Structure formats: structure tokens, C-alpha cells
């Protein structure tokens, strides 16, 4: 345990289901977002733990934990799909965990208006039909 005035109330995981390509659920693991690690408990033995920001692009759909990490190890390279009810917690948290370490979370949808970027077209010219 450790005798140095160290509390235990600091565990935030999420029972996420490990789904395959199709998405018919495989088993069920505990997604953990420690102070510096995405430890995805599974089979009470295998721990798919990344370095948090070691990912590449992470998303979620209502109650679906989606996270993709570049080539490294554990399971391999590719996108990951998970089914949980605390999808919000995990995401929301992560989004915060990133701001704490200035981590990269290039967010695309941010409700725009009219058009921020510009494409090659102007100036225009009359064709004269």
C-alpha cells in the first residue's frame, strides 16, 4: 500500500465491451484512465494500456467508446470499438486529461458558420454566352 499519506480514492475506469469489426461484442474489459495511462483491463490478466495520448484519433457515439492508436503493441494497429454506458465520462474526462498536458486532440466539428476556410476559385470571370 505505502505509508506516506497516500489516498486510494482515485480510480476512474469504465466497463467497456471489446467489440470486433462487425460489432457483436467479444467479452468485456475495464477501461482505465489513470493519471497517465489508458489501461484497458481484460481477461483479468491482459492489460491493453497505452500512453494516453499515444492514440491517433479518438471518438464516441452516444454510448460507444471509439479510440484509435498508431502502431505500437498490445493488440496492434487499427481502430478500436467499445460499447459502454459511461462513454461520456471516458470521453469528457480524456478531453480534460488532454488539456492538462496540452495533448493533441484536433477537434473537427466545432459548429461553424457560413465558411471559415477558403477554396481556389475567386476572382471569377464572365463567360459571355
Amino acid at each position: 500500500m505505502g505509508s506516506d499519506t497516500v489516498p486510494d480514492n482515485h480510480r476512474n475506469k469504465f466497463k467497456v465491451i471489446n467489440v470486433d469489426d462487425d460489432g457483436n461484442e467479444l467479452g468485456s474489459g475495464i477501461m482505465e484512465l489513470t493519471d497517465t495511462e489508458l489501461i484497458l483491463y481484460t481477461r483479468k490478466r491482459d492489460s491493453v494500456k497505452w500512453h494516453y495520448l499515444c492514440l491517433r484519433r479518438y471518438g464516441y457515439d452516444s454510448n460507444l467508446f471509439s479510440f484509435e492508436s498508431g502502431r505500437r503493441c498490445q493488440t496492434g494497429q487499427g481502430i478500436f470499438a467499445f460499447k459502454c454506458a459511461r462513454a461520456e465520462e471516458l470521453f469528457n474526462m480524456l478531453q480534460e486529461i488532454m488539456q492538462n498536458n496540452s495533448i493533441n486532440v484536433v477537434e473537427e466539428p466545432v459548429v461553424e458558420r457560413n465558411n471559415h476556410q477558403t477554396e481556389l476559385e475567386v476572382p471569377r470571370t464572365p463567360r459571355t454566352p
Partner: peptide, 22 residues
């Protein structure tokens, strides 16, 4: 594979958001 849980998708999914964390 090392067993693990997090399966592989190798294909995007109908997500509601879009935050690509490098």
C-alpha cells in the same frame, strides 16, 4: 495479438463527434 481485449476495426464508425487525438 497477445489476447488483449480491444479488438481491431480497421474502419471508421458512425461517430457523433470528431476529436482526432494524435
Amino acid at each position: 495479438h497477445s489476447q488483449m481485449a480491444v479488438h481491431k476495426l480497421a474502419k471508421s464508425i458512425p461517430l457523433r463527434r470528431q476529436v482526432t487525438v494524435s
